[PDB]
Write a protein that binds this ligand. Structure first.
Ligand code: ZDK
Length: 137
């Protein structure tokens, strides 16, 4: 599997409850739920860069698959986690060890769709991105 490309959000399902479960305050939940970030991904051997890009902010994950790293979620839910991203067959599985139980995500591809399930405390948010070709800085 190769996740490299540029991807545009098509749906974002149950995002509000996900953020509610991270204890994000009601006003930021409103701001956050309006954002439709693109995903720019470069898979370079086991080195993955995943840029979640929006006007409100860019969130950059830059990691080595299988190697735990310290993830600074300040500005999201104001936490830090020790995160590990691992291959689970054709799926990318992330566990974010920290204050919240069961926090992570799973990413996979179906045709020209990038699929992203985000999880915390038994709450699930599902996003789907379509692969696009128009790139502007
Ligand atoms: C492979 O992608 C992994 C994903 C898993 C989820 N995190 C955290 C997350 N931030 C957000 C949004 C967000 C949530 C809360 C506060 C501010 C922003 C967001 C939107 C646009 C750019 C950056 C962030 N929504 O979710 C981002 C990377």
């Amino acid at each position: 599997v190769d996740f490299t490309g540029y991807w545009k959000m098509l749906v974002n399902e149950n995002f509000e409850e996900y953020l509610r479960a991270l204890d994000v305050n009601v006003a930021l939940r409103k701001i956050a739920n309006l954002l439709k970030p693109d995903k720019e991904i470069v898979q370079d051997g086991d080195h993955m860069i995943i840029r979640t890009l929006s006007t409100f902010r860019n969130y950059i994950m830059d990691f080595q698959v299988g190697k735990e790293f310290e993830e600074d979620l300040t500005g999201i839910d104001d936490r830090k986690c020790m995160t590990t991203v691992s291959w689970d067959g054709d799926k990318l599985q992330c566990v974010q060890k920290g204050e919240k139980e069961g926090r992570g995500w799973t990413q996979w591809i179906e045709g020209d769709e990038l699929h992203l399930e985000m999880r915390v405390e038994g709450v699930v948010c599902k996003q789907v991105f379509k692969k696009v070709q128009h790139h502007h800085h």
